[PDB]
């Protein structure tokens, strides 16, 4: 369950997820990556589930990199609470994902098994995903 | 000062020949000598500082100045602008006379004095030595004394290099090793 360490502000404005991922759109650490084709919020629970799936499939023989970190606190109002009376409490942490973003990379393992590990991880994620190899340019 | 008149005639040329310097403005010289006394336990009694100032006055032959706390530290129980030390700076004739006196009379009076460390230069030709008992200076008398105090003697020289600084110090007769 990733989460920032001490932060500067408890709560944040909603914001707008718009545009393409021109940064973080390249397999830069491993040889092999799972890239997002759609935009959304990558919850820390989803990050942890797709990391546990990948690790269980690669079996301490390869290396995994996570390029998404949940640094955006998301608040929620509790049930039976009227509108107003301040902003709700923080309940979970998301990362804003744009189309093109790497989410995980794998290195040091067979291409077939890395493909199926990333395919298993994509099933836990709220994104249409594609699987990409690391290129030179 | 006899040591200044000796350095201007013999020691300067000897140092030049020793270090192999091609210009007379390259040979080192002592610029100043600073005597310090950390009396950090003051600002609670402020009589220890009186005695330290008197001892510095008698030792150096020059009225010293009380040095305040530049910052506030709780561990030492000191607040800003609190008098926590004493210092005097000697230049020219006064420093040459003081250093001649220190080398001749006072430095043999250090109890169990084998020598002074040659690696005590800061790395730019300046030397610093500690005197654990201020009674090695004959100016202070054993009859009237507050307590046993110590003192830093920092010799700030014009040398830019460790070896030049120690060659200049040793040309005066400094007890090294």
């Amino acid at each position: 369950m990733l989460q920032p360490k001490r932060t500067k502000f408890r709560k944040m404005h909603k914001g707008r997820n718009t545009g393409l991922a021109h940064r973080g759109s390249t397999v830069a650490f491993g040889q092999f990556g799972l890239k997002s084709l759609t935009r959304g919020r990558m919850t820390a629970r989803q990050i942890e589930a797709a990391r546990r799936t990948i690790t269980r499939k690669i079996k301490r023989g390869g290396k995994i990199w996570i390029r998404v970190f949940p640094d955006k606190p998301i608040s929620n109002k509790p049930l039976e609470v009227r509108m107003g009376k301040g902003k709700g409490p923080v309940e979970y942490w998301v990362c804003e994902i744009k189309p093109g973003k790497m989410l995980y990379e794998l290195e040091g393992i067979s291409e077939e098994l890395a493909r199926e590990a990333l395919t298993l991880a994509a099933a836990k994620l709220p994104f249409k995903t594609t699987i990409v190899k690391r290129t030179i340019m | 000062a006899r040591l200044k008149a000796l350095y201007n005639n013999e020691l300067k040329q000897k140092i030049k020949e020793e270090l192999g310097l091609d210009n007379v403005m390259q040979v080192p010289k002592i610029t100043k000598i600073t005597l310090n006394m950390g009396v950090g336990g003051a600002s609670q009694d402020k009589k220890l500082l009186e005695g330290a100032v008197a001892d510095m006055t008698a030792i150096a032959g020059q009225k010293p100045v009380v040095t305040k706390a530049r910052k506030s530290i709780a561990g030492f129980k000191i607040r800003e602008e609190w008098p926590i030390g004493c210092k005097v700076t000697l230049r020219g004739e006064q420093m040459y006379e003081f250093l001649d006196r220190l080398i001749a009379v006072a430095i043999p009076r250090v109890r169990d004095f084998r020598g002074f460390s040659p690696k005590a230069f800061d790395g730019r030709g300046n030397y610093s030595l500690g005197i654990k008992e201020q009674i090695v200076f004959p100016e202070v008398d054993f009859d009237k004394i507050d307590r046993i105090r110590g003192m830093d003697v920092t010799i700030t020289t014009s040398a830019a290099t460790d070896d030049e600084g120690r060659a200049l110090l040793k040309a005066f007769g400094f007890p090294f090793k």
């Binding site: - | 006055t57 032959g61 001649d100 006196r101 001749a104 043999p108 100016e139 007769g173």
Partner: protein, 61 residues
């Protein structure tokens, strides 16, 4: 040198009596006696030591 704020500073004839070597040097000391050097009579200060005087078993038994 600011006027009349510094201690008395006068020439003193330190003398290491062990090697009998003199050191003429201005100092703040006030000696009780005064001994004449080649010049005038300076306040004389005797010195016990100065820079001139300071510096198998089985087989035997």
């Amino acid at each position: 040198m600011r006027k009349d704020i510094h201690p008395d500073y006068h020439d003193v004839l330190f003398h290491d009596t062990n090697a009998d070597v003199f050191f003429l040097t201005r100092s703040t000391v006030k000696t009780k006696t005064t001994r004449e050097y080649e010049g005038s009579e300076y306040p004389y200060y005797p010195l016990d030591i100065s820079s001139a005087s300071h510096p198998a078993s089985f087989n035997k038994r």
